[PDB]
Symmetry: D2
Subunit: 319 residues, 4 copies
Amino acid sequence: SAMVLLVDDQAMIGEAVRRGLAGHESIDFHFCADPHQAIAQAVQIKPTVILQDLVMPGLDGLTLVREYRSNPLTRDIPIIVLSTKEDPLIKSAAFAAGANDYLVKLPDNIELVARIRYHSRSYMTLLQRDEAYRALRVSQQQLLDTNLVLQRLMNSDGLTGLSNRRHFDEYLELEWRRATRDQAQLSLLMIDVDYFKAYNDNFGHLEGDEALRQVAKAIRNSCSRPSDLPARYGGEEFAMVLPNTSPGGARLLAEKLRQSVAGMNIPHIAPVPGSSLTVSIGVATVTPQVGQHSRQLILDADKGLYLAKNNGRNQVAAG
Amino acid sequence: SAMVLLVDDQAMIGEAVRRGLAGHESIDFHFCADPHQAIAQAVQIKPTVILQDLVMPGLDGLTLVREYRSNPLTRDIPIIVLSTKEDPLIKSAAFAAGANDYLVKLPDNIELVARIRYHSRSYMTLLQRDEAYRALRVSQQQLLDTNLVLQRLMNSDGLTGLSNRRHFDEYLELEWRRATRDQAQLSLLMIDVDYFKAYNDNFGHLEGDEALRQVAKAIRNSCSRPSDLPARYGGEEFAMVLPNTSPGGARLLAEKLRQSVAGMNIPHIAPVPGSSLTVSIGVATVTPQVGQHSRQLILDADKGLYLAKNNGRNQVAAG
Amino acid sequence: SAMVLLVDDQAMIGEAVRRGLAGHESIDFHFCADPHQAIAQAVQIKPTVILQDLVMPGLDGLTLVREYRSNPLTRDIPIIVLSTKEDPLIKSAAFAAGANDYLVKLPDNIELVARIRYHSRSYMTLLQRDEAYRALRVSQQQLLDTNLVLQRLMNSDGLTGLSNRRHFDEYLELEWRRATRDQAQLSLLMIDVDYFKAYNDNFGHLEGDEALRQVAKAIRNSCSRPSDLPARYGGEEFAMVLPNTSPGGARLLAEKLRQSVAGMNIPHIAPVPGSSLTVSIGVATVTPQVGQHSRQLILDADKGLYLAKNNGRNQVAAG
Amino acid sequence: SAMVLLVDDQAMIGEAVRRGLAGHESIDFHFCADPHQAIAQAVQIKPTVILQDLVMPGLDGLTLVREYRSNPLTRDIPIIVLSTKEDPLIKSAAFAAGANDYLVKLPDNIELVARIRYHSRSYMTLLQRDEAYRALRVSQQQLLDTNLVLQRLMNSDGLTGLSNRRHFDEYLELEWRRATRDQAQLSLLMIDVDYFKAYNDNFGHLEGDEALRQVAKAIRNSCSRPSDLPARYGGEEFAMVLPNTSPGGARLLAEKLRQSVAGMNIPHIAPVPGSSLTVSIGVATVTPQVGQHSRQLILDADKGLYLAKNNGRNQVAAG
Ligand SMILES: Nc1nc2c(ncn2[C@@H]2O[C@@H]3COP(=O)(O)O[C@H]4[C@@H](O)[C@H](n5cnc6c(=O)[nH]c(N)nc65)O[C@@H]4COP(=O)(O)O[C@H]3[C@H]2O)c(=O)[nH]1
Ligand SMILES: Nc1nc2c(ncn2[C@@H]2O[C@@H]3COP(=O)(O)O[C@H]4[C@@H](O)[C@H](n5cnc6c(=O)[nH]c(N)nc65)O[C@@H]4COP(=O)(O)O[C@H]3[C@H]2O)c(=O)[nH]1
Ligand SMILES: Nc1nc2c(ncn2[C@@H]2O[C@@H]3COP(=O)(O)O[C@H]4[C@@H](O)[C@H](n5cnc6c(=O)[nH]c(N)nc65)O[C@@H]4COP(=O)(O)O[C@H]3[C@H]2O)c(=O)[nH]1
Ligand SMILES: Nc1nc2c(ncn2[C@@H]2O[C@@H]3COP(=O)(O)O[C@H]4[C@@H](O)[C@H](n5cnc6c(=O)[nH]c(N)nc65)O[C@@H]4COP(=O)(O)O[C@H]3[C@H]2O)c(=O)[nH]1
Ligand SMILES: Nc1nc2c(ncn2[C@@H]2O[C@@H]3COP(=O)(O)O[C@H]4[C@@H](O)[C@H](n5cnc6c(=O)[nH]c(N)nc65)O[C@@H]4COP(=O)(O)O[C@H]3[C@H]2O)c(=O)[nH]1
Ligand SMILES: Nc1nc2c(ncn2[C@@H]2O[C@@H]3COP(=O)(O)O[C@H]4[C@@H](O)[C@H](n5cnc6c(=O)[nH]c(N)nc65)O[C@@H]4COP(=O)(O)O[C@H]3[C@H]2O)c(=O)[nH]1
Ligand SMILES: Nc1nc2c(ncn2[C@@H]2O[C@@H]3COP(=O)(O)O[C@H]4[C@@H](O)[C@H](n5cnc6c(=O)[nH]c(N)nc65)O[C@@H]4COP(=O)(O)O[C@H]3[C@H]2O)c(=O)[nH]1
Ligand SMILES: Nc1nc2c(ncn2[C@@H]2O[C@@H]3COP(=O)(O)O[C@H]4[C@@H](O)[C@H](n5cnc6c(=O)[nH]c(N)nc65)O[C@@H]4COP(=O)(O)O[C@H]3[C@H]2O)c(=O)[nH]1
Ligand SMILES: [Sr+2]
Ligand SMILES: [Sr+2]
Ligand SMILES: [Sr+2]
Ligand SMILES: [Sr+2]
């Protein structure tokens, strides 16, 4: 829309303007003959452009152009100064004081509406851009948190915080392809807590969760290369994909981890009283060929996991 | 920033401007003496305000003010017309042709920069508001679909599409409170497919899912009041909360539904060969009192469900 | 699979069994002639059924049946006692000690495998049910938290915690239908912070968010009936759907809220220095008719909101 | 719980059992003297173990042991055969017919309850494991689809399907670290549609979305190595991270893509009538050093993007 605040001592100007603007529904008029209600009414009606007379009843017009740019409730409103006539410093001061125009009362009702229409409309879109900035900041900060949640949750196992299975499955599939392009050594650790049902059954399911937690922490601490990925494979089972790692490297890493767990010395009553939580690990490493399916790597790890288990638990074996 | 395209036949004007603007890094200048590259260069440099001479080498200046407002690649760029001197229709035409100003070459380098600074800056924020409109439309349509997904998924059971359990639990809790304020009759249907393990075992788990589907559809068709809510309570179990429904009303609704299922005549081999899928229903209705826990309503439905089951299945009984 | 631990002093029994079971790949055998490694090997091989001789080299067979049911690492393994011959208390003791069978060495290799096959297979599915219990508990507690997130997030505005817009839109649509069935009075509050751009601009966007927060809290405190719903309508705009509330009731509620906000006395510099954060509210209440679109209620609230605004802000007006 | 179906011709046996089981609330009894309602009642009461007499009123007991294992509604129920006395093939047949025990009517009420308690309880947990299998299959297939949604949605831009910004930001951060370990050449393409506001404004926002779509498709087709990642950087901006790619390689890839877009020959009216949609691209490639921040790579791409733009659009330039 449009709203012009006129401010001028003489009713004869307030009238000319009122008349020029009657045949324009798009734009409304508001006369303010009392320069000591000027900024007040400016705040109240929310004008989109104000017209300011430079000489009034013993109150400097430029003093008011001062306040307009001074009070930030008006700071941004376009100001056309109405003068009689064309004096020097008073046109230069107009602008020094913040005026955006300096007009002689009055051009015809064409340039008058044009000029009004222009400044008004600019202010309007100034309001709009600011409004948009707000709304965008909101939406952007809604997607802000939306992104945290689905991430901490899509790809993370809540209990341990390690990656989850579907992240593992999908991550490992990616790494398989990367590996085959680079003819790189892709290694995989398959990790299981020994005698876990037995732990779960006399300590409690929560106590087992807490146990899983501590083991999950040790896993997270074994690997520390950008592409090392630790995951909860499924329940008591953990995995750990190690791109670019040799069989001997993987095994070394596996043994430091196994020792770590045992070393926490977590009380278990299996296989015998006095026992502490142990962990069996299957190691497996492959350089993928085209056409080869990543499941081969998993199977190899499970062979290793199965071997380690069938040779006394708490040990590492390559499948 | 700021970019002024000057377009004027005389190098002496291109020079004055160039000079006025040298001591201003914020604003860059670009002279275009050839009015037959005017719009071309306008497109190329992306000016934020153009200054147009009205008389040039035998090419109407207002013809170019025409094109500027004509080509939408420039449509929105503020135009200050530079004239010599102040002729009549040529100021009125300035604006009729789209000009936003009409200046006499040249005011001092204060009003010249002021005026330039103003129009430039308005255009700038015109660009910004439009940019924001785009970005907001994107974000808003990201939350658009984001909302569909989590909704079709937070509150809906995928297989049947009925509400899910947590929606049921939470919805029923709400309705319990509404009911106790209104001392209204809150009814609940607890629905189970008879001999479902037996169905699942010789037809297949998928075939059972499809069976669940058809039953889920019938449930959805029994209730049709704004607050009626059908849910998959858990597996072979369905629920259906009926606010504002009498015991006799609930029972009537229960019997139409039970008949419906039986009537689909879905082949089952239990309890005997030749049988068709049946359904047992527990009815229960309560007017909640303060302090009373909604679990009472559920228990009552299960009594009914249990009774119906222990009296030959395929029937409705109030607990 | 199947794994039988035999424990018997005489190699001649260990042999008969070994022989009976050779032609059965499904089932593996393990002889334990030394009753002082019995439970040890039981732990190591994870048998699915153990056969226990009642008399051995000076170590009571029933003492071992004691330990089997004693150590929980074996607690659940089925025990067939092998005796010679059929003595009294020794069959009754067999069971008193935990035995699940009492056989005479030896039935033919049909009943022997049958019996073994049965107990073994039961234990097997005992293991399976327990495994399933674990895995189900996991999945269920994954959907546990999955449900919190999408809920606290699908339907809640993060900043204020009030409902969000899409929840409002959808909730109000539901309540419209409920209302038209009950020919009930549905009221709606449309709430806006007065001079918010002005607040946002000199205090900071965060400070405005914090301002929004405090106002959001007051809203949440105005309504307290099961179906009252407070929402962030969009930015500086809040809504509040009040089912079953009279026009006069809605207005009363509106005025207590408006006073509350003003009373927090939150420093604003608009409309004038020394001002405190105020709020304009639009009230509107409808009894919905069939065919009537809920948008009518919203429009009525906005009329009220618009009126209140155009009469000095910080007030309530019915549209 | 426990439910024994006895089936025997003589009431005197039905009585002994009834009596043995009265002092046991955990277990209920059900006598079936009419062998021609046997399976019928088996279906009706859902027994957890049935006791079967081998000789009855002119109806073979083993015929009924046949049906029990025959009808799958009973298939899994444990069967203790009650005989008088101990005949040969009739114990071997007992098992051949499916019996799980063969008892002489009757042992004392200790072994009788023991034996009953055992088979009953096994069946019970057979039911439980199956129940669990169902419930787990449900939960697992809820996480099934839950995973699709948040994935197709967390990491994918809906409109183009390319990765989104947060995936880009996070993916590129990962690749930066991988790159610095391998001292590998990490390249990045920054892609922008030339004159897009101009396209959006006279064709329509949807038409621009469709335009974005077609361009997004071409991008997706340029890169095809496991680690190449195409993303919508923000609105009209696209990105494309190319691990392990030389500056010259990146540029080659950039030029094939740019040509592709231009070649679709999508009608635009800018910069001039008759124009087709073009695209500007910034190329940049870095071998990351420790301590170096990935933002360097982005800046370099933007320099290139900026250069390309400030040299006529529709071209590739390295920043
Ligand atoms: N013209 C061309 N096409 C490219 C280029 N980069 C990837 N592609 C396209 O994408 C397909 C395979 O991408 P891959 O995942 O890298 O995975 C590759 C990779 O592991 C291996 N491979 C093929 N040739 C080479 C090579 O020259 N160097 C390396 N390091 N690996 C290669 O074989 C697998 C698939 O072979 P493809 O069937 O050839 O099929 C290629 C091809 O159609 C390229 O620089 N030029
Ligand atoms: N995927 C993965 N594998 C791991 C990790 N830590 C050790 N390894 C495996 O075990 C081998 C070396 O372990 P090293 O005793 O730490 O002894 C290391 C160390 O002293 C040095 N080195 C290698 N990279 C780094 C590094 O990024 N930081 C530091 N401080 N030293 C490194 O070189 C020696 C052996 O190099 P490698 O041949 O690379 O071979 C590695 C690798 O295959 C890990 O966090 N993730
Ligand atoms: N001063 C005031 N407070 C209000 C009003 N509406 C709800 N509240 C507040 O919210 C609490 C209970 O809301 P309820 O869920 O409607 O659920 C209500 C409802 O089911 C019932 N109830 C209390 N009085 C009335 C009543 O006069 N009419 C009806 N239809 N129900 C009532 O008792 C339950 C809780 O009683 P309360 O402990 O009293 O506690 C009330 C009270 O502190 C109100 O118009 N005026
Ligand atoms: N929660 C729920 N309950 C249902 C539904 N359909 C039937 N009932 C239950 O069964 C009673 C009447 O069923 P009626 O035979 O359809 O016969 C109806 C019908 O002819 C008329 N009536 C009630 N409301 C409607 C309506 O919304 N549409 C139409 N066409 N008739 C209605 O009044 C008669 C009985 O009114 P009631 O006392 O309300 O009592 C209802 C109610 O307790 C349903 O979709 N949801
Ligand atoms: N035979 C039968 N059908 C039922 C019953 N309850 C709801 N329906 C079905 O669902 C449609 C409208 O449900 P509405 O949302 O309750 O919303 C209702 C409600 O606001 C009003 N309405 C219709 N009759 C009654 C009535 O007898 N009592 C009340 N309190 N409202 C009614 O008109 C709206 C829609 O009218 P409908 O076109 O008739 O169409 C009904 C009808 O086809 C019922 O008890 N019996
Ligand atoms: N949607 C909604 N509306 C609200 C709420 N609080 C007040 N109202 C509105 O304002 C009217 C009464 O406010 P009252 O002064 O609290 O004074 C209340 C109060 O003393 C009593 N009353 C009504 N329900 C409750 C209640 O649930 N708890 C308590 N303690 N008193 C109640 O009855 C008098 C007036 O009853 P009303 O006619 O119901 O009419 C209500 C209602 O239309 C609210 O939390 N939510
Ligand atoms: N003892 C031991 N620790 C390991 C090993 N692998 C990674 N880490 C640990 O994780 C930190 C950095 O992992 P980065 O992301 O691979 O990223 C690495 C990588 O880009 C580079 N870097 C360090 N040494 C080597 C190296 O011997 N070979 C290669 N290819 N890169 C290295 O410097 C960056 C960080 O250096 P750091 O501060 O040393 O710190 C190392 C170290 O504390 C290992 O095999 N042995
Ligand atoms: N990140 C990324 N970069 C790409 C892709 N396609 C081409 N390039 C870039 O451009 C160079 C070669 O493009 P070439 O003409 O396809 O010609 C290729 C091609 O004939 C052969 N080659 C390389 N890998 C493959 C492949 O995976 N499949 C096939 N069929 N040929 C390949 O070797 C020649 C040049 O090898 P380069 O040195 O690797 O260097 C590549 C690389 O830096 C791509 O899909 N992703
Ligand atoms: Sr005057
Ligand atoms: Sr001239
Ligand atoms: Sr012996
Ligand atoms: Sr008999």
